Amino acid sequence: IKVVIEGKAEDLLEEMEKIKESLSKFPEEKLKELEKKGYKATIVVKEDGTITVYNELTKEKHTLKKGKVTVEGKGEKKIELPLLTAYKVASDIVETLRKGIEAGATDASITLEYKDGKITITVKVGKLEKTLTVD
Numbered sequence: 001i002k003v004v005i006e007g008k009a010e011d012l013l014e015e016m017e018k019i020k021e022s023l024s025k026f027p028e029e030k031l032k033e034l035e036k037k038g039y040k041a042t043i044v045v046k047e048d049g050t051i052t053v054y055n056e057l058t059k060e061k062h063t064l065k066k067g068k069v070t071v072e073g074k075g076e077k078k079i080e081l082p083l084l085t086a087y088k089v090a091s092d093i094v095e096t097l098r099k100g101i102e103a104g105a106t107d108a109s110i111t112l113e114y115k116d117g118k119i120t121i122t123v124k125v126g127k128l129e130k131t132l133t134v135d
Contacts, residue, residue, distance in 0.1 A: 001077040002113045003045055007067020009108035009125055013097040015066050019053055020090040022060055028084060035082035043079040043112070045071055057083070079114050081134070089132055093123050100125020 005012060023031065023041065039057035046052065049071055051064040081089070097108055105126030113120045121132040 001045055001071070001073035001075075001115070002111070003051060003072075004070040004109060004111045005051075005064065005067055006070075006109040007107070009097060009101045009105050011066035012108045012110060013094065013101060015062075015064055016090065016094045016097060018062055020087070020094050022053075022055055022058070022062065023083065023087040023090060025058065028087065031084040031087050035084045039083060040080040041083050041086035042081075043077075043114075045073075045077045047071070047074065047076045055083075077114060079119055081119075085134060089121065089134065092130065092132060093121065096123040096128055096130040097125055100128040103127070 005015075026034075034057050037057070042054040042056060044050075044052045044054065049069055051069060053062050053064070054060070093110065100108060100123075103126070105128065108123070108125045110124075111120075111122040117135055119134050123130045
């Protein structure tokens with residue numbers, strides 16, 4: 001499955017900061033506590049075009065909204081991540097979006113490819129491109 005979110009750089013940065021806060025409630029060593037307690041953070045790509053992010057021990061949902069969303073693939077998919085892993089990935093995306101906007105970028109896009117257990121994220125903010133991969 002492949003999901004792409006496009007739009008204004010600031011809107012994507014807003015969605016991202018909402019999510020990064022929902023996991024920076026806790027300082028990083030308690031997120032480590034939890035990711036070893038068995039509790040996860042989940043992405044759900046509902047096949048009606050919907051993306052939802054879930055926090056499994058503080059038990060919250062935020063459904064992505066801003067800009068245009070593209071899903072290539074059939075069936076809903078579902079990715080689980082350790083809570084500290086999730087916090088690190090969210091912080092990296094916010095940092096690239098911030099550096100991109102700070103250097104004059106107006107339009108951003110974020111691509112998530114989940115295949116074979118490899119999860120790959122690409123943040124493009126004008127001239128900036130960062131790529132992340134995890135298991």
